[PDB]
Amino acid sequence: KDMLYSAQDQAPSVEVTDEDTVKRYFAKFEEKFFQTCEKELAKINTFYSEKLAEAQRRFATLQNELQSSLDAQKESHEERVQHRNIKDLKLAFSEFYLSLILLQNYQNLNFTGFRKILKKHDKILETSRGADWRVAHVEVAPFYTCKKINQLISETEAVVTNELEDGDRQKAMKRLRVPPLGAAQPAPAWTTFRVGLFCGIFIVLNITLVLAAVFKLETDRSIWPLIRIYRGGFLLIEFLFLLGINTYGWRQAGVNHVLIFELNPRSNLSHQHLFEIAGFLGILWCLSLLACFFAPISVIPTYVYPLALYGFMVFFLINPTKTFYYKSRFWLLKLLFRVFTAPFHKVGFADFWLADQLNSLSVILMDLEYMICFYSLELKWDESKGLLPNNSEESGICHKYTYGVRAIVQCIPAWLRFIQCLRRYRDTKRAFPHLVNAGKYSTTFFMVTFAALYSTHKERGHSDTMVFFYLWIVFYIISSCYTLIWDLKMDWGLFDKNAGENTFLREEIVYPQKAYYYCAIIEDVILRFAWTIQISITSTTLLPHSGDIIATVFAPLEVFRRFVWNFFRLENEHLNNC
Amino acid sequence: QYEAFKDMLYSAQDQAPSVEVTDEDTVKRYFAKFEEKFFQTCEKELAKINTFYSEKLAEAQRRFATLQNELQSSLDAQKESHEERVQHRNIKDLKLAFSEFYLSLILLQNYQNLNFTGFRKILKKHDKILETSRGADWRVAHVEVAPFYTCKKINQLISETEAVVTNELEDGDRQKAMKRLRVPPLGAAQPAPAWTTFRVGLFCGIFIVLNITLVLAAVFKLETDRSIWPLIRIYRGGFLLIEFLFLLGINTYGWRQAGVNHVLIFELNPRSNLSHQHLFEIAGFLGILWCLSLLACFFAPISVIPTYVYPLALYGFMVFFLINPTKTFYYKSRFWLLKLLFRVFTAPFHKVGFADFWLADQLNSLSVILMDLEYMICFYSLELKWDESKGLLPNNSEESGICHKYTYGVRAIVQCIPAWLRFIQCLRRYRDTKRAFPHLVNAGKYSTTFFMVTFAALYSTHKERGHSDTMVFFYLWIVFYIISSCYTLIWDLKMDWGLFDKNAGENTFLREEIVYPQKAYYYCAIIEDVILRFAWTIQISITSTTLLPHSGDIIATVFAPLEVFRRFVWNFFRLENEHLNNC
DSSP, X not given: OHIIIIIHHHOOOSSSSOHHHHHHHHHHHHHHHHHHHHHHHHHHHHHHHHHHHHHHHHHXXXXXXXXXXXXXXXXXXHHHHHHHHHHHHHHHHHHHHHHHHHHHHHHHHHHHHHHHHHHHHHHHHTOSHHHHHIIIIITTOHHHHOOHHHHHHHXXXXXXXXXXXXXXXXXXXXXXXXXXXXXXXXXXXXXHHXXXXXXXXXXXXXXXXXXXXXXXXXXXXXXXXXXXXXXXXXHHHHHHHHHHHHHHHHHHHTOOHHXXXXXOTTTTOOHHHHHHHHHHHHHHHHHHHHHHHHOOSTXXXXXXXXXXXXHHHHHHHOOOSSOSOHHHHHHHHHHHHHHTTOTTSOOOHHHHHHXXXXXXXXXXXXXXXXHHHHHHHSOXXXXXXXXXXXXXXXXXXXXXXXXXXXXXXXXXXXXXHHXXXXXXXXXXXXXXXXXXXHHHHXXXXXHHHHHHHHHHHHTTTOTTHHHHHHHHHHHHHHHHHHHHHHIIIXXXXXXXXXXXXXXXXOXXXXXSOHHHHHHHHHHHHHHHTTTHHHHHHTTSOOOTTOHHHHHHHHHHHHHHHHHXXXXXXXXXXXXXHO | XXXXXXXXXXXXXXXXXXXXXXXXXXXXXXXXXXXXHHHHHHHHHHHHHHHHHHHHHHHHHHHHHHHHHHHHHHHHHHHOOHHHHHHHHHHHHHHHHHHHHHHHHHHHHHHHHHHHHHHHHHHHHHHHHHTOSHHXXXXXXXXXXXXXXXXXXXXXXXXXXXXXIIIIITTTOHHHHHHHTOSOOSSSOOOOXXXXXXXXXXXXXXXXXXXXXXXXXXXXXXXXXXXXHHHHHHHHHHHHHHHHHHHHHHHHHHHHHSOOOOSGGGTOOTTOOOOHHHHHHHHHHHHHHHHHHHXXXXXXXXXXXXXXXXXXXXXXXXXXXXXXXXXXXXXXXXHHHHHHHHHHHSTTTSOOOHHHHHHHHHHHTTXXXXXXXXXXXXXXXXXXXXXXXXXXXXXXXXXXXXXXXXXTTHXXXXXXXXXXXXHHHHHHHHHHHOOOTTTHHHHHHHHHHHHHHHHHHHHHHHHTTOOTTHHHHHHHHHHHXXXXXXXXXXXXXXXXXXXXXXXXXXXXXXXXXXXXXXXXXXXXXXXXXXXXXXXXXXXXXXXXXXXXXXHHHHHHHHHHXXXXXXXXXXXXXXXXXXXXXXX
């Protein structure tokens, strides 16, 4: 290690003084190596002596206890008491044996490391004194060679088994099977192989798809409904990948999230499996999309391909068997059932988190509405007309705002969150947080309803159309600026008035670099105000087909904002509470 | 004894009726019979246990005596850098033997303990059933006093031998002794980091998608106007090459499955080897490079450098990767392969090792690559005019056949390079050993290929001229085919795999001892070898059933990924037999 790199890179000057200086330097290096080896040997000997003394004391105590138990036996409440005493003595003996074995293993590992270091130094520096000294003194240590302690412990355990357990040798051996200790939690290699395979298939399919789209696909076709349908799956796969990154970060951070999540000591999930399912969903989505554009199979109508996709994903969750990781799917199903009712059931952090994530996941809620509209009152199912090359407003009455069919679905997550907030107020009997969150979420109601009001009144040309707009924009900030002040003060718990050596941040954190925290703050600030671009473009000339294109670009970003929000929210409550 | 006790208990339960079902006299007679049977079973179990313990003690004593004799021989050899390598091999073999003896002793002790525990449990169950107290006395008299469990001197002797080996030989190197005498060694990979397997999966997926998109593009997008066939001629070898690597990967997996020592026979560093996933990912890398090159040649998107850049660029990247002087991309293995090639081609000078002739045989079934290289050299150098675009030339021109005929006969010499090198190597081996029983016959077998190719070319060059007496030459050619083929089969069977041995025994059509789990593998491998080695014969069948001109050329390509298949299977048991003897 150090000898190969540092000593070789030292490169002392060949001609710096008389040869006496070079000889003295070589002698000093040899003496320093010898002194370091002697210090290591002395430390190893002291540790071995301490471990031997502790083991001897523990063995004496255990032998006294075993002799007393054997004398009492040789000479029912008494029988139960004796059994409990024997079990406790066996547990204490096992613990002492484990401690002594750990000490001996540590001493042996230290000796082996010292020998390896001495050998490496001798080989790199081309010296033979250190290796000879290690072989003569360190290598011949009787403490490591002496294994009679293990034999004595085995004899004591066998005597206890014979006198007390009456010949139960197999049970004693199984209970006291301790020698090559060591364990870990490595992920299966097959899982890694599968995730890499799916990642590669996804990458190659994505590039070939985009190449075909830019070259082979032509403009005159109608694309808007197609992307309108597929953005749902795109957001789903992005969200799955993003949660996988979340859970990997949490695991690497060492936050004991499992305790607050009261989950089974398996977490029911591992980031590799989330990456796997994300890759699988991406493969299905891309294959379906490419099939839709190409339509290779004869003259099959293209308005049937996406359906299976949607079916498939629900088909992945509604499998009644005990395959496809039957422990997480049932968990998510039962939690989602608990959420969508709300007042009837009690309050849980998982329900809160799921509602919070579904709040941002707006598009994946009215995308189904668009799908059902298009396939209900805009399709040609009875006949066989599967191209739809033209566009109009009447055919597409639902991609607009018009009725509340959009406002209600938009506010469904908002209504949920409002209701759990009120339930938390009722069962908690706490005023400030619930009462401020009620308005913090009802401002979304006000915003969306005022926007719908403008949308429906503009079609007629009423004067007050130019009045409500004034409210809408300000009704924007009353939401946005408010949400932000909720996000740092309590959600992330920043901007502490009792700031310390750190500026605008809590005095204690878990992540290494505070500049990451500052960048997270600035990116949250930038991302939350994304709707300004909408009015900026709709305060000038109206580009054709500019409506939904604004939604498309913001769609990944809205979910992307959720990423930074999870990390701090989980840790802020964790660190503040304890 | 546990199975007999369980069967006796089940029989007693079946013969046991309800309390009021049977009379008292019948119950008493059945109980007396059961007690006598239990006594007889206990006595027989004690006798069998004593016999088994005596046999185990005798086997342990024999193993200890063999280990002591081996240690004495090693000490005598040491008392009285090739010598260093021999000493290292002897030390490794002695360490392996000592570890095997210690593991066998531990397994015998564990088996004796398990047998005693099972006998005690059976006695307790019998006592519970029949309500008798003699079971405890029998267990005390037999289970506790078992000689195999009581004899722990094997462990002490093994420890003393290990300490003596560490002191006298290793000069106090206790770490090496502990590593060599450790219970676990081979088996669990050791698991590589997930990045390696992730790269393997990424590359294999990219390969599969490029393959499928390439075949779809070829079947659909291609326009049938140009003879694509010459193109295959300049790619086939690369294909074979990449396929070759893939197979060897699985090969090493087999080596890690049966547990046979293969790193030692290669004198490679025991602490550093090339795990299969690295070979797999190199295979994926070269395969995806080949696929993209083929696709680019197939579509030709950029019309400035039409066709000349693709194969040359592929092979240039190949050679640049192979001899990369940087300290990455598994540099150690690449320099090792370069040194091996240097040693094998410098055959008459340096000593012949295992890897030398292994890879000589490897290249023997790789000569298609050599033919491809000479053909592409001929095309690019002799008749091709560089100042051209694409190369869309109808085959109506008389200019063809310049590199298609044999002319000087260069095809035979490049074909027979492996034969000549193997001939020289085996003759040198004879010169080194002064024994000709297993060597000059190998020389003649390999020299048969000389007559093969020479007479094939002779009939080819005399076919167009007529000379109806050339049918004698045809008969000669086919009879050399027959003799070469049969000699190759008899060598591969009797010698290379040791099967068809006159000492067969109950293992019909096999040797006395095997390692690989199943025998069906051996049989199917035998039938596979015998079928595939006669591949050329199928070729002639086609010319006896078809009269289409230039038919044979297209036939060759399907035969190409077949000699790689025969060696892939042949390579497996080749190591197994060489495990026993030494070269």
